[PDB]
Scaffold this motif. Structure first.
Motif, PDB file in Angstrom:
ATOM      1  N   UNK A  95       0.814  -1.204   0.000  1.00 23.88           N
ATOM      2  CA  UNK A  95       0.000   0.000   0.000  1.00 23.88           C
ATOM      3  C   UNK A  95       0.853   1.262   0.000  1.00 23.88           C
ATOM      4  N   UNK A  96       1.964   1.254   0.744  1.00 18.04           N
ATOM      5  CA  UNK A  96       2.780   2.443   0.945  1.00 18.04           C
ATOM      6  C   UNK A  96       4.052   2.469   0.112  1.00 18.04           C
ATOM      7  N   UNK A 124      -9.605   4.295 -13.128  1.00 18.81           N
ATOM      8  CA  UNK A 124      -9.283   5.698 -12.925  1.00 18.81           C
ATOM      9  C   UNK A 124      -7.848   5.841 -12.468  1.00 18.81           C
ATOM     10  N   UNK A 125      -7.645   6.637 -11.421  1.00 19.94           N
ATOM     11  CA  UNK A 125      -6.345   6.744 -10.791  1.00 19.94           C
ATOM     12  C   UNK A 125      -6.032   5.676  -9.773  1.00 19.94           C
ATOM     13  N   UNK A 132      -6.318 -11.291  -0.642  1.00 18.71           N
ATOM     14  CA  UNK A 132      -7.356 -11.762   0.259  1.00 18.71           C
ATOM     15  C   UNK A 132      -8.685 -11.119  -0.076  1.00 18.71           C
ATOM     16  N   UNK A 139       1.598   0.872  -4.593  1.00 15.51           N
ATOM     17  CA  UNK A 139       2.453   2.045  -4.628  1.00 15.51           C
ATOM     18  C   UNK A 139       3.623   1.801  -5.585  1.00 15.51           C
TER      19      UNK A 139
ATOM     20  N   UNK B 397     -12.519 -13.510  -4.699  1.00 19.17           N
ATOM     21  CA  UNK B 397     -11.449 -13.035  -3.824  1.00 19.17           C
ATOM     22  C   UNK B 397     -11.577 -13.774  -2.497  1.00 19.17           C
ATOM     23  N   UNK B 398     -10.932 -14.933  -2.404  1.00 17.13           N
ATOM     24  CA  UNK B 398     -11.012 -15.753  -1.200  1.00 17.13           C
ATOM     25  C   UNK B 398     -10.116 -15.159  -0.123  1.00 17.13           C
ATOM     26  N   UNK B 399     -10.680 -14.973   1.065  1.00 12.03           N
ATOM     27  CA  UNK B 399      -9.971 -14.505   2.241  1.00 12.03           C
ATOM     28  C   UNK B 399      -9.731 -15.708   3.156  1.00 12.03           C
TER      29      UNK B 399
ATOM     30  N   UNK D  49      -6.358  10.662 -15.067  1.00  7.04           N
ATOM     31  CA  UNK D  49      -6.434   9.895 -13.835  1.00  7.04           C
ATOM     32  C   UNK D  49      -6.974  10.751 -12.697  1.00  7.04           C
ATOM     33  N   UNK D  50      -7.837  10.145 -11.883  1.00  7.48           N
ATOM     34  CA  UNK D  50      -8.354  10.804 -10.692  1.00  7.48           C
ATOM     35  C   UNK D  50      -7.302  10.963  -9.604  1.00  7.48           C
ATOM     36  N   UNK D  51      -6.147  10.301  -9.734  1.00  6.62           N
ATOM     37  CA  UNK D  51      -5.073  10.486  -8.769  1.00  6.62           C
ATOM     38  C   UNK D  51      -4.555  11.916  -8.774  1.00  6.62           C
ATOM     39  N   UNK D  99       1.073   7.170  -5.638  1.00  5.05           N
ATOM     40  CA  UNK D  99       1.439   6.922  -4.249  1.00  5.05           C
ATOM     41  C   UNK D  99       0.591   7.720  -3.275  1.00  5.05           C
TER      42      UNK D  99
END
Ligand SMILES: Nc1ncnc2c1ncn2[C@@H]1O[C@H](COP(=O)(O)OP(=O)(O)NP(=O)(O)O)[C@@H](O)[C@H]1O
Ligand SMILES: Nc1ncnc2c1ncn2[C@@H]1O[C@H](COP(=O)(O)OP(=O)(O)NP(=O)(O)O)[C@@H](O)[C@H]1O
Lengths: 630, 630, 93, 290, 176
Positions: A95-96, A124-125, A132, A139, B397-399, D49-51, D99
């Protein structure tokens, strides 16, 4: 070769590790925890020019530390699949964008399948990737490195296409190359210079040669008629006049140097093969006894002792004598260091293994593969029911042994010769037959002394197996020297070993057979050296706290610590090994751990320690003396 | 769904009536697709009194399912004799269909709970209401089950106290006579559209049988686990020819033969793994056709490059290779900058897979099973064709702690979208998220019938009925009864929702699937992706290294060159030679891995993604080094 | 029942009563090690009785159990039945 | 997409010109222009892009040295700016945008989850409703705290920093509440099971009985207040909830310690009770007259 | 090269062991004989273990030829056989600890030959010949059962209680 066949033009003497990396990057990697080898440098390059995320197979564990030190600026974090909080850490890293190292990929979770495959879904963006239940935002900065401490793993074909492999595994050729490079650096440093200079006629020297032209052009147009301040600018132009010709000489002298290093390196190659064989035998020692665990650091420390700290090399300048002395000292020191931590039964076994290794590596002797094959698997030969005849003077078992031995071509006439020998019985009933084995094998040519030794070994195995060990000793004495085994038949000299051959962070593991205590040896050594020693008995939870306090004091103050009967605490021993891996002990610090030989001692602690096996001296006399003293 | 009367069907319904007169619990076993479910349903519905309740068992089924069914259809009434469970409808015998009696998982102690529950019901004629803790008696309740043999992987044997009560029949495959009769009826129905080809009904029907039987004799489950044949393949053949002929106003006999051969190839030649087996199928299609359709010239009727597509023209008619190549290339270049920006080369063995995937998308109840090496286009071609045909892609999407209720809800949502809203969906499933086999037997009902009973039970049934009637009004059909609305919903789900399974070959022994159930192979249309040949590697190399300046006007072609691509341009240029060498790399690496397997070493899977990564690295490195030198 | 085992040991020590572990081998490794440590402490406390120098006019023997000093009566004893195949834990050998 | 359709129509229209017109290098210019627009259509898609936000448009303006106005910007101004030559800058800016969008939507997830999280309550012997789901609550809090701590390391973190810090505080406070709360629950439940099951415990331990009465009244009032507003954020904002729960934890621990000491004294008075469990010993002493 | 020699070794081991061990034909008359019961149990155990070892060696030889891939169990088996270790999968009767594999398969061949001989004797002359056959107690998987069976046979023949019978040993060098 295939490129050459197609008339595609390519460099003849390509260096992969040099063509794909600049010397600044290699220096940076070596500044990090990179073992400097050809294989390791190639692997480090593979961790730089990867499109797909890498799978680092590193039983040593150096590569994980290398990745961690390289990416410390990017705040890489450690994780493992087995950890409960793995999925959430992976989610955060994805994510980061912080880089991640995931360990123990032998239990590879399948949730990482799209992440390695880069199955971005663009909306989109928002660039989602499924993990999971969640759909998390990839990122840009995210990078993952999978790791494996296990080198024996069969990954699914699903994961192989999703990952590029990077094998940090020691093998025969890798250790052979490492040892050969070490010898060339230690004993013929001129050839080491001429070898490093042959891989510097690639980008390094020409890059420097034109980087000097950069500074030349910087200080060439800085002119307003002041070029002739003294008409001595030629110095700056002469500094480039030298090196050019120098790097034009070496380019011309790039075939003579290549042939020279080839010829000089093939000379020192049998030593490298012996080194690889010896180390892999030490690795093989595990399945003989659980205590016989030795790291590669053990063999490399043996080799550092044999090359640099060898008193037998002093005053010797001829390189052939130095090579011979190095080989003999390698075998001797390897046997001494290993057998000091072995039970007395297995000393002859390891000596036989080293003798066979030298016989493989010795010059002028045949391998004797067939004779040793019969020695180890003669019983595997089949005797049909009723095919065993009766021989005068031989029992049934000796008859089967002679029939099996007659399969070999040298012993084809063995039965008739045994029958015709009048003085056979006196030999067969002798107390020391191995010293006077009769000549029975047929030879087309006279045999070498080692050939006679192995033939006598086969005969003694056939006729008098009870003396086989004694005969085996003679074989060792025929191959590795008379005093080779003698140093073990002596009292343990812990003083010099602990002073010189033991580092402060390596604990001295004194293992004893059950019922025998060896702390008296350490107390005697501490008295002899005049060194304060603190001894603690681990038998309760309090003893762990006392040991921790004492070790924390001694590691700073350089004192000696002894822990008695540590086999009672396996988990605490694992904790102590983990602690010891992190310390920066004083030079005079020493940690002795006295234990009884049990399988519950951690394998890693034995691997990361100096093992000394103590057994009582056999005999009624010593037993009564010990009882009376106690 | 009313079964075509055949010899096996009449026998089995006679036995069904004989064993239902005594209320004994009938059970039928047999290989997948033999026809047990249809015969059971038709025979049960032929009776006037019997009220069929279709329950499908799974690994997670329990007594709760049967109790819920009794609460739905039956009711408890108090009587002087005792509490009695009876159907709400007076004078009707409620019969429960348990379509997979074997499939419920055994406990840790080897007993199926639901099987024991049914056993106590059938043997004691009742059960204990747990809430009231009181005995109740069934009055007009019966059970009639279907099974696959217990040798199949997902199945289990039944308790011997249970098998005593049930008489088990074995519904083997119909055989040649029954197949000829059944598909004579079907093809006589199918040819009614075009009135000039009725006379060719019976000659065709034998061919569809004969070749099918020949395949059933030539390819068996031993050679590959997915070489499974059944009358489901014959019905798929009939459906394919029917969909081909439905928009067509007229045909000649030769066009009918061509469509027949195309469906033969698309149903049988795709599943095959080995090239020579495909050649055998190629020859045998021609042999069968010319045997059963004499005096029809082969060149016009069946040319080897047979392709049928609907993109070029509004009708499903044959098209040339080049026009389809150009159209797919243009649409793929569009797809680059639309959904996923990764180049995708069209080679001879990927256009065919595009056409196959499109074909299965156009059929009703068309579910595809793409099996092949890791990489190679599956999960990328499926997405591509789904995008081309406008099918919104749904992926599960299996968790962790992803119970069967979550899969049930996902199936509910996709079914509502596909049936009520008339939105075509390609339901993509991958082996990564299909790790658990417990939920993959809920999908079998969908694949075989298009409706999974028990999903929408409760208020969900009312909401789905409301939305279904709204959708029917949108389509212009006025429906009132809930049964007819549910049937129309099922037909819409047959038309719209498709399932695309993606699997690797049978190396997943460690998984609970092992080789997945033969029912799953039977229900889907199987497509062997395989590994890229020399031509595929050559073409995917040329179109990735075409932007590079690999041109040398002075390339002296060697007198004798080694070639992996037999169809290289001759005399080869520098680019051609470089790409041929790039394919040599892959071929030599495959040979090296095979050799390492030969000597017992640990091998690693080599996949097309290795080649793509190699070409990407070659391009990046070429650009970098040329930029540096410039 | 582990959670009573410390309590049971304190009861045996204080009241005076025997305790026999039937098939002590069958305890799992964690269970075996913890109970072995407890019985080791109790046995050391008992062995402290035997020395002759300790006069028993004023001799409050004690053992460390449940982080408290529990007085041990001399009449108490502990027995450990074993099934070979094997040996007793190294604490109590 | 519509732009690509129009450009394709234009290119196909251009391809139909007579061959005499085509040999000219000026047609060639227009065809090359449309080809370039097609080539940069990918970057045009990425620029929708919406980013991208006002900050990222400002970054593009500064780095490309163009004074655009976002409301007044036209397709032609972006087209005639050399996006083909400057693709590296555009790629860098949209990477930064991706990011920052990831971090922003993560904070959005935190805000939505904790604004919509309700503390489940289950009745307990018709005396009050105790909280259920401690494992889920603590797992979610741990996940969010760890994820915010990992977000603090992100290279794009400086933009959202202040907001992240705010949530960090709240998240810690939430943990700092419920880590106490479960304890104040458990002991109370335990003590309740001892102080009402046996009616003779009042006579054995009068002072502890009175203290537990005064504690149960306060805890019941607090649980009633929670039941009237079971949202996590509503509960956290209760005036002095943290200090009150710390006081309750301290006093319940003291009463449990007193009860344990009393039962240990009773055990030591008659040592055979050491063979008897806690509940059994409480039954024995409480039923001294029965 | 290790598999080149292991191929020959496994081939020789397959050649040594007999292909099958015929099972004894239980009847109403012979089941009363304790000796037949003991030898039937022995033949059952020996035949089962014989099939196990023969299948394992066949798989090993197939692997050495490249026909069969190395599974995990198979790979462990090659690891044991190459080193001379007796696999755990082969030990189902009491044997000396630390024995190599050649001694084990030789004892196997002797035991199976004895079992074949006694089975042939039973099939030819019935259970009555089980008394006159000279049985090597080393070649039985449980000779204690044979001693008990001999005691039971003597008790049945002479109608004496089992408690009242005691054992004596006579060592005879005379042939016949
Ligand atoms: N007599 C027949 N008439 C028409 N179609 C038939 C006949 N016999 C078999 N089929 C076809 O055989 C296929 C299998 O039908 P089906 O009854 O669903 O098999 P199945 O055994 O129930 N599958 P499963 O329940 O998973 O074991 C269908 O395509 C049927 O149309
Ligand atoms: N014909 C092709 N030309 C170029 N790239 C391709 C082609 N087919 C696949 N790829 C690429 O190969 C990679 C993996 O393809 P893909 O088929 O999705 O793997 P996969 O088959 O799904 N592996 P798995 O899902 O575990 O079975 C992706 O980066 C694709 O873009």
């Amino acid at each position: 070769h295939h490129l050459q066949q197609a008339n595609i033009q390519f460099r003849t003497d390509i260096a992969r590790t040099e063509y794909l990396s600049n010397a600044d990057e290699r220096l940076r990697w070596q500044a990090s925890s990179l073992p400097a080898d050809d294989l390791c440098t190639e692997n480090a390059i593979m961790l730089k020019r990867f499109n797909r995320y890498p799978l680092i197979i590193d039983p040593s564990g150096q590569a994980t530390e290398f990745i961690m030190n390289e990416y410390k600026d990017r705040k890489i974090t450690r994780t493992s699949f087995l950890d409960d909080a793995f999925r959430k850490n992976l989610e955060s890293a994805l994510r980061f964008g912080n880089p991640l190292l995931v360990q123990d990929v032998e239990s590879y979770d399948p949730v990482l399948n799209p992440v390695l495959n880069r199955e971005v879904r663009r909306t989109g963006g928002r660039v989602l990737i499924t993990l999971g239940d969640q759909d998390i935002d990839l990122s840009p900065s995210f990078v993952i490195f999978l790791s494996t401490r296990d080198p024996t793993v069969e990954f699914p074909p699903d994961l192989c296409s999703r990952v590029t492999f990077v094998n940090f595994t020691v093998t025969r050729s890798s250790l052979q190359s490492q040892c050969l490079n070490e010898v060339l650096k230690a004993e013929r440093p001129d050839v080491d210079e001429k070898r490093s200079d042959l891989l510097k006629l690639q980008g390094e020297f020409q890059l420097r040669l034109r980087q000097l032209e950069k500074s030349l052009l910087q200080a060439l147009n800085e002119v307003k008629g002041r070029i002739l301040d003294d008409d001595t600018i030629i110095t700056t132009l002469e500094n480039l006049k030298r090196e050019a010709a120098e790097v034009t000489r070496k380019v011309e002298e790039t075939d003579i140097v290549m042939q020279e290093v080839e010829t000089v390196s093939q000379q020192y190659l049998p030593l490298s093969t012996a080194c690889s064989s010896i180390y892999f035998t030490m690795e093989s020692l595990k399945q003989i006894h659980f205590l016989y665990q030795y790291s590669l650091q053990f063999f490399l420390d043996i080799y550092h002792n044999v090359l640099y700290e060898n008193p037998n090399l002093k005053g010797v300048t001829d390189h052939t004598q130095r090579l011979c002395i190095i080989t003999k000292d390698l075998f001797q020191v390897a046997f001494n260091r290993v057998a000091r931590g072995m039970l007395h039964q297995d000393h002859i076994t390891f000596a036989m293994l080293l003798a066979r290794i030298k016989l493989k590596g010795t010059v002028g002797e045949p391998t004797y593969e067939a004779e040793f094959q019969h020695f180890l698997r003669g019983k595997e030969i089949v005797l049909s029911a009723g095919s065993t005849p009766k021989i005068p003077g031989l029992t049934v078992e000796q008859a089967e042994a002679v029939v099996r031995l007659s399969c070999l071509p040298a012993f084809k006439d063995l039965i008739a010769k045994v029958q015709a020998d009048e003085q056979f019985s006196i030999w067969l009933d002798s107390s020391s037959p191995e010293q006077t084995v009769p000549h029975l094998w047929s030879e087309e040519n006279p045999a070498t002394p080692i050939g006679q030794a192995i033939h006598r070994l086969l005969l003694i195995q056939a006729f008098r197996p009870d003396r086989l060990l004694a005969m085996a000793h003679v074989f060792v004495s025929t191959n590795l020297g008379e005093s080779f085994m003698s140093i073990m038949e002596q009292p343990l000299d812990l003083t010099h070993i602990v002073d010189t051959e033991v580092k402060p962070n390596t604990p001295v593991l004194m293992c004893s057979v059950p019922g025998y205590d060896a702390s008296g040896h350490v107390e005697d050594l501490a008295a002899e050296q005049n060194t304060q020693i603190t001894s603690i008995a681990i038998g309760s939870a309090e003893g762990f706290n006392q040991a921790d306090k004492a070790i924390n004091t001694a590691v700073k103050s350089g004192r000696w610590v002894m822990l008695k009967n540590v086999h009672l605490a396996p988990g605490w021993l694992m904790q102590l090994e983990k602690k010891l891996h992190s310390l920066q002990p004083h030079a005079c610090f020493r940690l002795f751990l006295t234990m009884e030989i049990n399988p519950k001692v951690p394998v890693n602690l034995l691997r990361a320690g100096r093992i000394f096996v103590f057994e009582p001296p056999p005999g009624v006399k010593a037993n009564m003396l010990r009882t009376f003293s106690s | 769904d009313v079964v075509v009367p055949t010899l096996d069907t009449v026998r089995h319904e006679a036995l069904l009536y004989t064993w239902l007169a005594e209320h004994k619990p009938l059970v039928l076993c047999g290989p997948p697709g033999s026809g047990k479910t249809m015969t059971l349903f038709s025979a049960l519905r032929a009776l006037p009194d019997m009220e069929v309740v279709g329950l499908n068992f799974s690994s997670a089924t329990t007594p709760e399912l049967l109790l819920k069914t009794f609460d739905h259809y039956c009711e408890y009434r108090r009587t002087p004799n005792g509490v009695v469970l009876a159907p709400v409808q007076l004078g009707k015998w409620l019969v429960l269909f348990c379509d997979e009696i074997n499939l419920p998982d055994m406990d840790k102690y080897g007993t199926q709970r639901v099987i024991s529950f049914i056993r106590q019901m059938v043997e004691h004629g009742g059960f204990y209401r747990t809430s009231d803790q009181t005995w109740v008696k069934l009055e007009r309740i019966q059970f009639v089950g279907a099974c696959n043999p217990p040798t199949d992987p997902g199945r289990k044997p039944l308790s011997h106290r249970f098998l005593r009560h049930v008489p088990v029949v074995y519904v083997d495959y119909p055989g040649p006579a029954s197949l000829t009769q059944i598909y004579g009826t079907f093809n006589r129905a199918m040819l009614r559209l075009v009135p000039s080809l009725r006379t060719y009904a019976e000659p065709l029907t034998a061919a569809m049988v004969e070749f099918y039987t020949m395949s059933q004799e030539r390819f068996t489950q031993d050679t590959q686990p997915h070489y499974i044949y059944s009358p489901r393949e014959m019905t798929r053949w009939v459906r394919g020819i029917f969909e081909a002929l439905r928009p067509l106003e007229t045909l000649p006999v030769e066009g009918l033969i061509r469509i027949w051969a195309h469906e033969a190839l698309r149903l049988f030649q795709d599943r095959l793994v080995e090239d020579e087996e495909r050649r055998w199928t190629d020859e045998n299609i021609d042999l069968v056709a010319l045997k059963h359709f004499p005096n029809i010239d082969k060149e016009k009727a069946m040319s080897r490059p047979i392709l049928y597509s609907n993109w070029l023209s509004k009708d499903y008619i044959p098209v040339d290779q080049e026009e389809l190549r150009d159209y797919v290339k243009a649409r793929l270049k569009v797809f680059y900058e639309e959904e996923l920006d990764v180049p995708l080369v069209l080679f001879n063995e990927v256009l065919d897979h595009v056409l196959r995937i499109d074909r299965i998308f156009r059929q009703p109840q068309g579910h595809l099973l793409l099996i092949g090496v890791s990489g190679a286009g599956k999960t990328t071609l499926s997405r591509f064709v789904a995008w081309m045909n406008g099918l919104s892609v749904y992926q599960i999407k299996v968790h962790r702690k992803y119970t069967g209720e979550d899969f049930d809800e996902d199936l509910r949502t996709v079914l509502r979208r596909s049936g009520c809203k008339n939105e075509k969906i390609a339901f993509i499933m991958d082996e990564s998220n299909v790790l658990d086999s417990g939920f993959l037997e809920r999908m079998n009902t969908l694949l075989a019938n298009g409706e999974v009973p028990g999903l929408f039970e409760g208020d969900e049934y009312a909401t789905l009925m409301t939305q279904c009637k709204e959708g029917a009004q949108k389509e212009g059909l006025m429906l009132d009864s809930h049964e007819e609305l549910y049937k129309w919903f099922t037909s819409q789900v047959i038309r719209n929702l498709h399932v695309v399974f993606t699997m690797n070959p049978s190396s997943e022994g460690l998984k609970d699937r092992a080789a997945t159930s033969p029912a799953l192979f039977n229900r889907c249309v199987l497509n062997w992706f395989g590994d890229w040949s020399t031509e595929a590697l050559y073409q995917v190399g040329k179109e990735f290294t075409s932007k590079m300046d690999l041109e040398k006007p002075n390339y002296v072609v060697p007198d004798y060159m080694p070639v992996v691509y037999d169809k290289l341009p001759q005399p080869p240029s520098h680019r051609e030679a470089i790409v041929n060498s790039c394919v040599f790399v892959h071929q030599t690496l495959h040979q090296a891995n095979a050799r390492l397997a030969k000597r017992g070493g640990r091998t690693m899977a080599i996949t097309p993604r290795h080649y793509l990564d190699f070409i990407n690295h070659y391009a990046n490195l070429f650009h970098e080094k040329r930029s540096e030198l410039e | 029942d582990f959670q009573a085992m410390g309590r049971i040991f304190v009861g045996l020590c204080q009241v005076g009563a025997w305790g026999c572990f039937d098939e002590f081998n069958r305890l799992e490794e964690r269970m075996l090690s913890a109970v072995s440590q407890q019985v080791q402490c109790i046995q050391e406390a008992l062995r402290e009785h035997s020395s002759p120098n300790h006069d028993k006019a004023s001799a409050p023997i004690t053992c460390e159990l449940l982080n408290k000093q529990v007085k041990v009566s001399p009449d108490m004893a502990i027995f450990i039945t074993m099934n070979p195949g094997s040996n007793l834990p190294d604490n109590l050998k | 997409r519509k732009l690509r359709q129009n450009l394709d129509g234009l290119l196909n229209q251009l391809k139909n010109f007579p061959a005499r017109l085509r040999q000219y290098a000026s047609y060639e210019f227009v065809q090359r222009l449309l080809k370039g627009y097609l080539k940069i259509n990918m970057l045009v898609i990425e620029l929708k892009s919406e980013a991208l936000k006002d900050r990222h448009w400002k970054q593009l303006m500064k780095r490309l040295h163009v004074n655009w106005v976002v409301s007044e910007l036209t397709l032609g101004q972006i087209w005639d700016v050399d996006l083909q030559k400057n693709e590296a800058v555009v790629k860098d800016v949209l990477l930064v945008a991706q990011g920052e969008m990831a971090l922003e939507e993560f904070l959005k997830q935190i805000r939505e989850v904790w604004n919509t999280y309700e503390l489940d309550l289950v009745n307990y012997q018709n005396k009050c409703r105790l909280i259920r789901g401690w494992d889920d609550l603590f797992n979610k809090v741990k996940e969010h705290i760890n994820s915010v701590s990992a977000m603090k390391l992100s290279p794009y973190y400086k933009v959202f920093e202040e907001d992240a810090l705010s949530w960090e505080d709240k998240l810690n406070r939430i943990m700092a509440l419920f880590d106490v709360w479960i304890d104040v629950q458990r002991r109370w439940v335990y003590l309740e099971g001892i102080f009402t099951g046996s009616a003779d415990i009042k006579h054995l331990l009068p002072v502890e009985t009175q203290r537990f009465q005064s504690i149960s009244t306060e805890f019941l009032a607090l649980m009633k207040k929670v039941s009237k507003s079971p949202l996590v954020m509503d509960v956290l904002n209760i005036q002095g909830v943290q200090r009150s729960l710390e006081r309750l934890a301290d006093l319940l621990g003291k009463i449990q310690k007193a009860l344990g000491e009393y039962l240990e004294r009773e055990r030591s008075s008659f040592p055979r009770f050491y063979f008897v469990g806690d509940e059994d010993l409480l039954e024995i002493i409480g039923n001294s007259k029965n | 090269a290790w598999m080149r020699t292991l191929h020959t070794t496994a081939s020789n081991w397959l050649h040594l062991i007999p292909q099958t061990l015929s099972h004894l034909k239980r009847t109403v008359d012979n089941i009363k004989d304790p000796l037949f019961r003991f030898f039937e149990r022995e033949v059952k155990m020996g035949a089962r273990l014989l099939q196990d070892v023969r299948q394992d060696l066949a798989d090993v030889v197939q692997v050495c030829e490249g026909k069969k891939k190395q599974t995990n169990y198979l790979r462990t088996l090659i690891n044991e056989l190459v080193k001379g270790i007796l696999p755990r999968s082969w030990s189902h009767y009491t044997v000396p600890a630390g024995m190599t594999v050649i001694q084990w398969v030789s004892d196997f061949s002797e035991r199976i030959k004895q079992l074949q001989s006694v089975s042939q004797a039973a099939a030819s002359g019935g259970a009555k010949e089980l008394k006159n056959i000279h049985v090597c107690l080393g070649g039985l998987f449980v000779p204690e059962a044979y001693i008990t069976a001999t005691r039971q046979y003597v008790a049945q023949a002479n109608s004496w209680s089992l408690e009242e019978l005691c054992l004596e040993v006579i060592v005879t060098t005379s042939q016949s």
